[PDB]
């Protein structure tokens, strides 16, 4: 039986790795795996993997198609179905096996398919669920975030429906964090009693921004400033107007 039709409880991580490596020709095994099924009026199984390295630089390679393999009742259909998952998750590798799709479905009907849209929404929900489970382990989440932080920020820009969950996955240096990147929830725990806004500064290097005088000003009060040191962060805070009810404020206003 194909591994994706087996019960996840009975599959070792070495069996997943072996399958992951034959599927992707990676020389390393997966960083993470999410194996699940939906049943009832919609019926399908999915076996998704996060690679240990970003497959390409996302921002210089926009609109790359995902490589998930689509099956119908265990018969391979295609492996470049754009609408199976949104672009910011196009690094996800693996297999989706649908029971209800037409076996003879063309790509143009696939594009219009209501079954494909409900499958896609389930993939996103389970990927985000995987990322949050991965955030429980601080050491391996650092590995994921180094490779895919740009994808999370691209999602914040492009996917308002999940913008809340995605924002919980962000990590940043701050004027109070030293060598560690922290979450917005962590920032919120340290806010002063009177503080009603989340302060950030955008810039180019950690050092130039840590030396900046707008930061020094708030350092003189008991106030923490978030370091946003990549160009997507501009787009990112535009749509991330606030968090936990706290408005985001640039220290340069």
Author numbering: 294 to 546
What does the paper say about this structure?
Hsp90 belongs to the chaperone superfamily and plays crucial roles in maintaining the stability and the activity of numerous client proteins, including kinases, transcription factors, and steroid hormone receptors. Hsp90 contains three well-defined structural domains: an N-terminal ATP binding domain (NTD) for ATP-binding and hydrolysis, a middle domain (MD) for client protein recognition, and a C-terminal domain (CTD) mediating Hsp90's dimerization. Owing to the involvement in cell growth and the up-regulation in multiple types of cancer, Hsp90α is becoming a promising target for anti-cancer drug development (Garg et al., 2016, Prodromou, 2009, Sidera and Patsavoudi, 2014).
In this manuscript, non-covalent allosteric modulators (SOMCL-16-171 and SOMCL-16-175) targeting Hsp90α’s middle domain (Hsp90M) were developed for the first time. The perturbed residues in Hsp90α upon the binding of SOMCL-16-171 and SOMCL-16-175 both localize to four fragments spanning N360-L363, D372-G387, K443-E451, and I522-E535, which are spatially close to each other. Compared with the binding of SOMCL-16-175 to wild-type Hsp90M, its interactions with Hsp90M F349A and Hsp90M D350A mutants are almost fully abolished, and its interactions with Hsp90M L382A and Hsp90M K443E mutants induce less significant CSPs of the corresponding residues. The mutagenesis study data suggest that the α-helix spanning I522-E535 might not be involved in the direct binding of SOMCL-16-175 and the compound binding cavity in Hsp90M is composed of F349-N360, D372-G387, and K443-E451. The docking model was then obtained, and the binding pocket composed of F349-N360, D372-G387, and K443-E451 for SOMCL-16-175 in Hsp90M was confirmed. The slow conformational exchange in this gate-like fragment is expected to favor the recognition of the active compounds by Hsp90α’s middle domain. P395-I408 is named as the catalytic loop, which promotes the ATP hydrolysis process by moving to an open active state and interacting with the γ-phosphate of ATP through the conserved arginine residue in the fragment (R400 for Hsp90α) (Meyer et al., 2003, Prodromou, 2016), whereas K362-D372 is spatially adjacent to the catalytic loop and is found to indirectly modulate the ATP hydrolysis process by its intimate interactions with the catalytic loop in Hsp90's middle domain (Meyer et al., 2003). Meanwhile, as revealed by the CSP analysis data, the binding of SOMCL-16-175 would induce long-range allosteric modulation effect on the hydrophobic region spanning K362-D372 of Hsp90α’s middle domain.
